[PDB]
Amino acid sequence: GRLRVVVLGSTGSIGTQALQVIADNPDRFEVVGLAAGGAHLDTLLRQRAQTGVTNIAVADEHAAQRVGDIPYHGSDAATRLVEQTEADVVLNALVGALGLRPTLAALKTGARLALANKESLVAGGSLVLRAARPGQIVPVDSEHSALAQCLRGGTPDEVAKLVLTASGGPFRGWSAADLEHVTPEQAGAHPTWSMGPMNTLNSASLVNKGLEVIETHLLFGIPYDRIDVVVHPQSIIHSMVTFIDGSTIAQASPPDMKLPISLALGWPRRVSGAAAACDFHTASSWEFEPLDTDVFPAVELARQAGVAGGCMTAVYNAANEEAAAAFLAGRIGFPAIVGIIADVLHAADQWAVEPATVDDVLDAQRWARERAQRAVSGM
Amino acid sequence: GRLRVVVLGSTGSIGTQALQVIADNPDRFEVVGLAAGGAHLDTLLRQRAQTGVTNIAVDIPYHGSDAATRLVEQTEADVVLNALVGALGLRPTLAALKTGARLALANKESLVAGGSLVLRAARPGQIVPVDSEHSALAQCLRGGTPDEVAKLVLTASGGPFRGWSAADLEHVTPEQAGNTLNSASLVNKGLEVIETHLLFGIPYDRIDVVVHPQSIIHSMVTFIDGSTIAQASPPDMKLPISLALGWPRRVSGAAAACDFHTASSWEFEPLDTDVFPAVELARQAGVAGGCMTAVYNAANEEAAAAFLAGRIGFPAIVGIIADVLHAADQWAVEPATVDDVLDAQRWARERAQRAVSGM
C-alpha cells in the first residue's frame, strides 16, 4: 500500500509540494530518493535531514568541492539514482534537458512516471513513448491531469476532441498592432537567471500552450486536428474532453498544484484532502472565449511542428528558447519570437526523422539554437 | 448488438426524441412497443405508420388503465423507456424491473413515490436515468471509485423567478409559470435531490444544489481530493436519452457538442432557500424516508393543480407541501406494497385539498 517514491528536482516548487503531500500522507507514500542540481545543494541537504532520506543525488557536475557525502553526483547522477533505486513512482520535476535521461531510465525500471518535466515529451517525443507501457506516464501539469481525469468519461474510440483551457496570458484581447512594440517587462517578464521570466514569456506568447498541445498529442494519442485550445481567464476548468455523442466532461478546482501532483503520485487512486474543492457559496462566472489565432500563431505552429513529427517538436522548443531569450535582451521585438520559430522550422526538413537515441534529440536542439541565433543576428 | 426498445409515453417530448434517436441508429436500436395516453392520438397513429409498430398500448392490442403495464409484461425487450407522467408510471416501472430489462427512467414519480419498493424490485445498475442531471452525475461518477465521492452537485436553472421575492411570487399566472411549473417552484430540484439519493445511494447532506442559469453544466461530482468533474452540453434531451438507451456505450451524433468558437459565460449562484424552500423540504422528506417522498410529490401535484385551476396563488404551492409534510408524522414507515404508496398519495392529496379549501 505504501508507494515508494523518487522525487527528482525536489527543491523546486513541484518537488517541495510533492514532499508536502507525501509528508501529509505517510500511509500512502514513502520517499526513497531525492535529486537536485548542484546550485541547490544547501536546500537538498536540508531535505535529507527533514525526510531522513540518505539516497540523494546532485544532478550535475557542479558544487564539486562540496560533494563527499552525496551518494550520486556528476552530470548524469539523477539518471543513476533512478536506475539503481527500487521504486513504484518516479516524480520527474527536473527542469529542462536534465529531465530527459532520468525520464527514460524511469520508464525502463517499469515504475510509474509522474511527469512534470516538459522537455521529456516535447523534445524526446517518440523516444520517450517507445520506452513507456500504456498508462505508465501520468502527467502532473494541471491541463494534462484534467484531461486524464475527463478521459474516464468514455472509451478511447468515443473521444471526439481534447480541449485545453488557456488563461490567455497578459496580452489576451490585444491586437497585432498593439503587440508590435511591447517590452519584456510589459509581458510580466522581468529577465532573471531563473526560468521564471521565460515561463512568463511563454505564457504571454502562447508558446506554453503550443508546448502543452504537443504533450497532449504524445500523452493521449489524439491527432493534432482534434486538440483545441479555449481561452478561459479564470483557470477554474483545467481542461475538458468532448465525446462523440456531444457530451463534454470537464475537470474543475481552485488553482492548487497539490491536486494534480497528488493524483500523479497516487494514480489511479485519489488522495483525500490534497486540495480544496470548488465552493458554490459565492456567485461566480466562468468565461470562455476563442483564441485569437491570427494574433497568437504559436499554437498552430506547434501543431505544424507536431504534425511534421520526430525531432521537429524539439526544434520548435529550442528555437523558442533562443528567440525568447533574444526578446528578453531587447535584441528583437515580440512578434519575432514566433516569427523566428517559423523560420527555423521551415529550414528544418532534416529534423522530421524520429529520434533513434538521446543524441539525435541533442543534435536537433543544437542545430535549432544555431539557426535561431543566425535568425536573431539578422535583424 | 441491436437493442429492442419499448417506449412508454411515446407521444411526449422525451418519447418523440427517443424515437428520433432510434430512427437515426437502426444498427443500435429497434422500437418494439409504444404506449400513449390518448390526448395526442394523432401522433401515436403517425408513429405507428412510421415505425411499423402495431404493438401499442393506449385494432389496438392493449387498452384500459393497466394497458401500458400489460404491454411491458408480454413484449420481448432489452430496454424499457418509461417517459410516462406521474401515477401512470409506477406500475409499468415495477413490471419493467420484473422483466429483467434495463429501465431507462424518465418518469420521476416511479422512484420518488415508490422509493424503497422500487429499489427492492431493481438489481444494481438496472435503472439508468434519462434525467439530464442524473445522466450527468452517472458520467461524472466515472471520474473515480465509489469510495472517492465527497459530494454530488446538482445544477438548477433557478426558473423564471430567479431574483424574485416572496411578495413578487404572489402575483404569477398559469401562463407566467409556464414540470415547467415544478422548475419555477424548485419542487423539480427537490424531486431530483430525492432521485439522486435513491439512484446513487449518497446521504442527503452530501447532495448540494447550485443555481446555473445557462443550464450548460448539467451536474457535477466532487471527489475527496478536491477535484470536481462536470458534464456540459448545450441543453438537448437527446443526449441523456441516447446514453440511457445504449448504456454504457455513447451514441455518435446524438447531440451538438459545446462549441467554443463564440464567447460564453457559465454563471453559478447560491439558491435563495428562504424564497425557495422546496429543496430543503425534499431533504426533510427524504431523510424521514418511507412513504414521505410519495407524500412530498402527491402534495405538490395537488397544490400545483389548484394553482393551474386558479384556485390558489403561486407561493401557496410549496407552502401547502410544508403543511402536509408536517402533519405527515405517521408516514415515516417503509411501503411494503404498491397500495401503501397509493394510500400515502391519497392521504397527501386529501390533506392538500383541505389546505386549499381552508384558505
Ligand SMILES: O=CN(O)CC[C@@H](c1ccc(Cl)c(Cl)c1)P(=O)(O)O
Ligand atoms: O432535466 C431537466 N429538467 O428536469 C427540467 C428542469 C431543470 C432544467 C434543466 C435544464 C434546462 Cl435548459 C431547464 Cl429550462 C430546466 P431545472 O429547472 O429543475 O434545473
Ligand SMILES: [Mn+2]
Ligand atoms: Mn500548464
Ligand SMILES: [Mn+2]
Ligand atoms: Mn432534470
